[PDB]
């Protein structure tokens, strides 16, 4: 290439347009969220159905217990017809924030489980859970009323 | 489904979902066409997958021109394993291409070429004979 041709090619080079304000650093305009999700909607529906149907719920911390012992305790509860369900906290928070049980949001921290029942077998559930003294009864609800472990013991007695 | 037998522009998707893209110019012949068709028929299933040619029958092929296009209900990984081998067997540099990246690249290139903010352009200089630059310039380069 001749030097003049090289100079011409250098001068006719693409130069990018520079906006005054960077797109990343300017305020991001509000945008529509996802239209729908296959799993989150199902989880919300299941949570609503369980909350409406079951009258007694007990929210406790799910410790890293052995699977065999956990299944034995689940069978013991099923002998009294109590269902153990665990849902993601990142999905439970959105439902709990705007619902009847708004004050129970702080309960759902980390690995949590809910023992639910249509029949409030509180005494039987407490006697079954007393086998493992390290399992803490974080909270509960009976007839749409917020209650703690002491209140649950009072109701059982 | 199988490509029709071959005897002895076009850079955008029309029907298919994946394609074979060429990065350089080349020439294709009856032997190449027949070998590629045989390989595609051997590595394809007529029940679900369809393949379409885009080049004319015997052939000069330019850069970025799609020659073989693949469609059906399949993922990119299901077709890449064989389209990469077809691209390697092709007589020029070629690659298995996906629309989700090809269209994005084309749109970005068009946007850059439209948003170029250089006041002086090579076409402008060559046409206006500025600086007397056509003293050192090819006669075909005025349009080329």
């Amino acid at each position: 290439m001749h030097f003049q041709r090289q100079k011409l090619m250098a001068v006719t080079e693409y130069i990018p347009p520079k906006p005054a304000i960077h797109p990343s650093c300017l305020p991001s305009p509000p945008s529509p969220p996802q239209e729908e999700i296959g799993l989150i909607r199902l989880l919300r529906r299941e949570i609503a159905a369980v909350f409406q149907d079951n009258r007694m719920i007990a929210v406790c911390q799910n410790v890293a217990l052995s699977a065999e012992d956990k299944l034995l305790m689940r069978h013991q509860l099923r002998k009294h017809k109590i269902l153990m369900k665990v849902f993601p906290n990142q999905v439970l928070k959105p439902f709990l924030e705007d619902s009847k049980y708004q004050n129970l949001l702080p309960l759902f921290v980390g690995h949590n489980m809910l023992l639910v029942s249509e029949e409030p077998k509180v005494k039987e559930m407490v006697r079954i859970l007393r086998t493992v003294p390290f399992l803490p009864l974080l909270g509960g609800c009976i007839d749409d009323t917020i209650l703690s472990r002491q209140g649950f013991i009072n109701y059982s007695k | 489904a199988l490509l029709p037998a071959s005897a002895g522009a076009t850079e955008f998707t029309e029907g298919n979902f994946a394609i074979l893209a060429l990065g350089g110019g080349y020439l294709h012949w009856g032997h190449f066409e027949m070998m590629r068709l045989t390989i595609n028929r051997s590595m394809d299933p007529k029940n679900m997958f369809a393949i379409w040619r885009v080049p004319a029958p015997f052939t000069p092929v330019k850069a970025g021109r799609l020659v073989v296009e693949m469609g059906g209900r399949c993922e990119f990984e299901e077709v890449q394993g064989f389209l990469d081998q077809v691209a390697h067997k092709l007589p020029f540099a070629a690659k298995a291409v996906s629309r989700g990246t090809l269209e994005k690249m084309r749109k970005d290139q068009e946007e850059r070429e439209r948003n170029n903010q250089n006041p002086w352009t090579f076409e402008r200089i060559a046409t206006a004979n500025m600086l007397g630059i056509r003293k050192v310039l090819s006669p075909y380069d005025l349009t080329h």
Binding site: F3, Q6, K7, L8, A10, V11 | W120, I125, A128, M130, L131
Partner: peptide, 29 residues
């Protein structure tokens, strides 16, 4: 030996192009 352009060479080319463009304008009336 490779050759490369510089900033002031760029400026000189651009100013000469501007002069020739002004000549183009004035040669149109």
């Amino acid at each position: 030996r490779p050759r490369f352009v510089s900033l002031r060479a760029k400026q000189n080319m651009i100013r000469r192009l501007e002069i020739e463009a002004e000549n183009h304008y004035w040669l149109s009336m």
